């Protein structure tokens, strides 16, 4: 409503720049990384990389080069922003107070000037005489360096040649020289102009121009020995130096476009090339010193490289916009040591309310082709490490207190392959040890601290009651025919040790192990529990068991052992763990199966009849549960590959994720070196930690090796529809097998209505839990999945996966043919319901009030679903330049356009047609579109911007949609969608970008906007930004056609940075306001409570 | 179209570059929008049009009938077809109505509330758009052929006025002034226009077959005279330094302001280095220009290629500023085309011709 909030959910994760030099000090070889808005610095150490500084800029980073001018101690760094904010920055830091220092800055944007196709190019001279900029066609800007050019005053020099591919400086010339490839009608050619500062003009370069490749795309500046300039084509690679010509054309490079290279040997002998087919190459140069020959090896296969820098000793950092960033080690093949989760160009996403919780989850379609994937982002909690000792294969963990007098515990017991260890935990130093009464040669099924000052250690052998005060054994209970124990579960006074089918009940009185009951079971015993429910004395009246062979949860009355409720769970999957614990007040049950899928029941101790049932799959490997007393209440730490914590708040259940790869077993330990902490184990190590009250994000990549396009969730089918697109070169054959080849069941669309490397489109049924591809549908020849739908249509209450596709043929560059298909997945098989032929591509589909709305080219169209199981068109609307995005609320419909900004097309039912209610007449090329409520609307401008319209209220002019918010974000936003990743503001809108930045948006009342607005400008006073760049400049709406300050939008990150500034400088921000220091600090954190 | 979209979503190719790249694709397949109409008011063939610099919603038109028509170009009918209506018009009833042919009408750069009008009634008139009254009226010894203000900045408020008098006349809007004159041309000046790029640079096209570029801050001498043979020709004085073989009557700067287009009576277009005056020898071939008055023609912007729309007979010929290659000749007018004016927001174009009918040209598909 009128005024809005913009804060980051996830930072950009994609690298469109990396650069390597002595940045922090003369000998620390830094790797510096450019992710769009952010600049990361790292020391190279023999083992891994050391993060020294990650900083945020006000502007997208377009140029980044290190350089050292004569006299200066260490390399200085240039940056330039897409808004052309140049800056030269030094890095100085005393102690640990870390500083980034501006030595120079200046915006160099020439108000007009046609901005060059290949885009901004920043190069710097070998001798540091000047800094050259090809920004705009026909114009070469020249930022000088030979005197204190602090304001970075530059002059232009006209450039006769206007279409230019790439330009670099060159080595060993007596005057700064540029070597560029340019294009007239005679193809692409290479040329040299020397550069003069006094003349302020280009003169004649050392050698004359030479013809080069039609697709010559790149210029490598060969250093001092040899000299010259290497030019990377697609067919061939040429070298020119002035007296020599040398050209090779290996068959191993023509496949794909070599996009990024880097000098490996500082004498320019080895060069790492790299292409979009992920392939790392080696350019070798051969050695009165001249060049002798060129040579290229194929080194291996990598994430598709945007930028690369070779560190030291075979190590290479790989920048990728297109997938997961890598760090690879050269070996024939190439082994990636490390790999960095970049959410590739986030092409689509969905909020999923799984676990029907107060919290949703995000699944994207991230990356393209070989890096193509989904991604699962959601909120979670890591643990504060203290000890992570490496004890492989711990089948169990129990805490005990060695001294009966102590109210602290100083014993931890661990199950193994056949025997049982003992861990002393010497205050703050864990060590192995012995224990009398407790065997270290039998496999422990249970132990703890029981009643009448006694101990217990149930092993496979027998129940063996121990007196704690003197040690030793006061009782031992074994099956009469001398047999082992099945499923052990005990508390502090009672035991019911299972054997095979039978059940042998026990009680732990003083110095005696008593029995009361023995009974057979229908089937062998699966899992047991009694945990002190109701207490009343410290006792159980029930027993929680499951079976095998039937898979049945059985609550029994204890002494009588009679069946009250024999629950049936079905399936060939059998119960794993079971527990009984009280939340808030109510009595719940929790049965964890072998596959994760957990049941939680409503229970009463008098009856036991299980009421209200649910099924919250919290993992995939067997899930063993454990109660742990989290301060005021007890929580449940489940154990699978998708570990979870469970507690309740306010009479409904919460399912908090844990940020760990897998936790096998767990038990609540409150020592003194580790008071109320955790004891956790996985396949390799044993870890001790504490809950992280700061709730970060968890991401789970799910590789696809092809292009993900759309994603919507079907609740009844409990799975995902995913639109895929694998490349195949000309019958064809795919290059690498993707997720659409390795399905279980497949299909190829049959339709006959529509009668050298092609895209093949599949619809992917992906299970919501396993994340495997249940079904893959191959669409027709050259059919293009562009829209996707999960919903039910008509009165027909069957859910459908509906896809809108087009027919792609080389001749036409706009589709005149496409179809809308209705699919159905249930009973494990992909049914096809209905067809529909239309005269072009469908770019958008969304359910509308019981109807299917779809954007067929320059037409927005509405469909009803005939009882005849076909689609009927109710009304059309022809006036659009290109209907790309649809979003709905009520009878209103938003329409984004290729350039017409946004129409709030409406629908009045009484006649059933399309009334144009209100349009925006700003000429905006659109990326994404969304309704916050019936009054305000957010859209994404092609030039990385966010505006909000509004309806205007006294005449017929009201059809003009009034802009009420302007904002520059910096991220090209590919999609919005409602929802929140938690549980001061209203509503919750999430967006996915190309740079992998995930963004929250929400709404505010004037009282806030004003209060927060001054605070921002008050921060920009106190804050020293990186390149000395203003905020409300970086936030001012900018295209070519307009520039206007940020109004109607608060930057949450600017507000959030407040908790990272120094103490008195906060009081400075207050000064006056309209509100004392500590009122602010709370609500800032309270605004963290939304993202 | 689809590959454009799948690149942009993935962030393969720069988004705003793909727009530029996309936009030249539209200018190419631009045709006479038949579903649009400019309302007929002008009784004379249209000598000028001008579309607003900020948002380009309203338009001014000039006519030989001494009329200034003001148009809305938007649509808000629930239909895809519409007729540009005139919001206002300075018609014959009006107290200040232009007495004779209206040759330029220009929106005040950096103020939509005002605009300007010069005619063959030897006046220049300043206008309040919102009230429709007048503000200032100037008067000249000779028939006005062209007038302009720089769309660079508001550091100056000079209006270049190019009458039949060889003296070029600069009129300060701030105060009456009008005393400031530029001297050097010898015959009727037929076109004036400022550099988009440069604040105080003015170009001047007289009938004496030469062109000049003036720093108006300089109290004597122009900066350069466009010489078509680039010095190569050993020409005797006062015949040397002549841009066109005949009277020069058309002038428009290149989007960035790095070049200049002179079209003269000799049927040539020439592209010129706006700095040193270097004839770039970009051909265009013969461009029929046989007008006795100014030739009003525009240039495309915000597209990769830069096109130039010069009125050719009963058509608007479309060239490629830097290639010289003609794309086509927009055909819809039955009589000779006087002016054409390019719309940057939807790569559109409006032609005012002697057929007394302003026509709309949009790209197709």
Author numbering:
A (entry chain A): 1 to 287, 294 to 337, 345 to 743, 748 to 772, 784 to 981, 985 to 1014, 1023 to 1113, 1124 to 1140
B (entry chain B): 1 to 365
From the paper:
The versatile nucleotide excision repair (NER) pathway is an important defense mechanism, which removes a remarkably wide spectrum of DNA-helix destabilizing lesions, including those induced by UV irradiation, via two distinct damage-recognizing sub-pathways: global genome NER (GG-NER) and transcription-coupled NER (TC-NER). TC-NER is initiated by the stalling of RNA polymerase II at DNA lesions. This triggers the recruitment of the SNF2/SWI2 ATPase CSB and the CSA protein, which promote the assembly of a large repair complex that unwinds the damaged DNA, excises a single-stranded DNA region containing the lesion, and promotes DNA synthesis and ligation to seal the gap4,5. CSA comprises a seven-bladed WD40 propeller that, through interactions with DDB1, assembles into a cullin-RING ubiquitin ligase (CRL) complex with CUL4A/B and RBX1 (CRLCSA).
CSA is a stable component of the DDB1- and RBX1-containing CRLCSA complex. In this complex, it directly associates with DDB16 and likely functions as the substrate receptor. Importantly, the interaction between CSA ΔN and TCP1 was substantially increased as compared to full-length CSA. These results show that interfering with the CSA–DDB1 interaction, either by depletion of DDB1 or deletion of the DDB1-interacting domain in CSA, strongly enhances the interaction between CSA and TRiC. Importantly, we observed 11 cross-links between CSA and TRiC subunits CCT3, CCT4, and CCT6 involving CSA residues Lys34, Lys85, Lys167, and Lys212. Although this does not provide information about specific residues that mediate the interaction, the location of these lysine residues in the outer regions of the β-propeller blades made up by the WD40 domain of CSA suggests that these regions are important for the interaction with TRiC. Since according to the 3D structure of CSA–DDB16 this platform of CSA is not directly involved in DDB1 binding, we expected that the combined eight mutations would leave the CRLCSA intact. To unravel the effect of such disease-causing point mutations on the CSA protein, we created GFP-tagged CSA constructs harboring patient mutations A160T, A205P, or D266G, which are found in WD40 repeats 3, 4, and 5, respectively. A160T and A205P have been predicted to interfere with the integrity of the overall fold, whereas D266G is expected to have mostly local effects.
